[PDB]
């Protein structure tokens, strides 16, 4: 398997964490895409991924699987025992809900804030920027932190009693938040504690 990514990207982190979690890092050849050079916006990479983002998985037969959620679903089901994406119908549903909600309310908006209301990847890569939109996404992400704090006052992991794809998305959300110095509010005690715990997981600790 090939993963096209940048090693320190927060979305890439979602797949790298999931790979470690599945003891599969050794099954993967990582190929560097230089986002700083806008390599992801040029025809060669766009042929690997219409949406122009990393990571993207390429299988031995050339099948391309793009999107963190889809890659995770692929690698989680491979060894026949899913430990990230759910076994029962309720688990699959709640994990996908929380995974998507973490994208919507935390990770995606931090990333839109990076690209739109900061220099981001630089003026040659960020050809269009909407600062007003980017700033509102910053605020959305802050609300997201408060939302995930309320979740974590009631359960030990984002989707319930077990570690899942959803924790990985929030972790990636907080990694991005650190990149842009969007501070987790002091009063977000449950989110802070959970994150410290997450940073103790081998998969996460090695990466950071």
Ligand X SMILES: N[C@@H](CCC(=O)N[C@@H](CS)C(=O)NCC(=O)O)C(=O)O
Contact between 79 and 143 (Cβ < 8 Å): no
Instruction: Name the binding residues.
Output: 11, 40, 54, 67-68, 115
Partner that binds at residue 111, options a copy of itself, ligand X, none, CB closer than 5 to 8 Å by kind: ligand X
Q: At what angle do helices 89-102 and 165-179 cross, to 10 degrees?
A: 10
Instruction: Name the binding residues for glutathione.
Output: 11, 40, 54, 67-68, 115
**Dist CA 11 CA 173 (whole Å):** 9
Please report whether residue 113 would count as binding ligand X according to CB under 6 A.
no
Query: Which helix or strand (DSSP H or E) is residue 4 part of?
Result: strand 2-5
Contact between 108 and 116 (Cβ < 8 Å): no
Q: Residue 167: how many CA atoms within 13 Å on its side-chain side?
A: 28
Shortest Å, Cβ 193 to ligand X: 26
The dihedral region occupied by 62, where left means phi > 0, alpha psi between -120 and 50, and beta the remainder, is left
Binders of ligand X among residues 65 to 104 (CB under 6 A) are: 67-69
Q: At residue 163, what are phi and psi to the nearest 5 degrees?
A: -60, 135
Nearer to ligand X by Cβ, of 69 and 118: the residue is 69
Partner that binds at residue 54, options a copy of itself, ligand X, none, CB closer than 5 to 8 Å by kind: ligand X
Nearer to ligand X by Cβ, of 103 and 188: the residue is 103
Please report whether residue 139 would count as binding a copy of itself according to CB under 8 A.
no
Binders of a copy of itself among residues 50 to 69 (CB under 8 A) are: 50-51, 57, 59, 63, 65-67, 69
- Closest C-alpha among 154, 72, 140 to residue 112: 140
The footprint of ligand X (CB under 6 A) covers 9-12, 35, 40, 53-54, 67-69, 111, 115, 121
The footprint of a copy of itself (CB under 8 A) covers 50-51, 57, 59, 63, 65-67, 69-71, 73-75, 77-78, 88-90, 92-94, 96-97, 100-101, 104-105, 128, 130, 132-133, 136, 147
């Amino acid at each position: 398997m090939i993963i096209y990514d940048t090693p320190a990207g927060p979305y890439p982190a979602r797949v790298r964490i999931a790979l470690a979690e599945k003891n599969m890092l050794s099954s993967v050849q990582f190929v560097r895409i230089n986002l700083w050079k806008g390599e992801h916006k040029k025809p060669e990479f766009l042929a690997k991924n219409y949406s122009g983002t990393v990571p993207v998985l390429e299988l031995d037969d050339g099948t391309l699987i793009a999107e963190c959620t889809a890659i995770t679903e692929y690698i989680d089901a491979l060894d026949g025992t899913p430990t990230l994406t759910g076994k029962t119908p309720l688990e699959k549903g709640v994990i996908h809900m929380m995974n998507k909600r973490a994208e919507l309310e935390l990770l995606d908006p931090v990333s839109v804030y990076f690209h739109h209301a900061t220099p981001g990847l630089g003026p040659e890569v960020e050809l269009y920027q909407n600062k007003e939109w980017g700033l509102r996404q910053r605020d959305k992400a802050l609300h997201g932190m408060h939302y995930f704090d309320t979740v974590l006052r009631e359960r030990p992991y984002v989707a319930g009693d077990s570690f899942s794809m959803a924790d990985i998305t929030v972790i990636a959300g907080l990694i991005f938040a650190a990149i842009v110095k969007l501070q987790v509010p002091e009063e977000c005690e449950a989110l802070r504690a959970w994150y410290k715990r997450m940073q103790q997981r081998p998969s996460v600790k090695k990466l950071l």
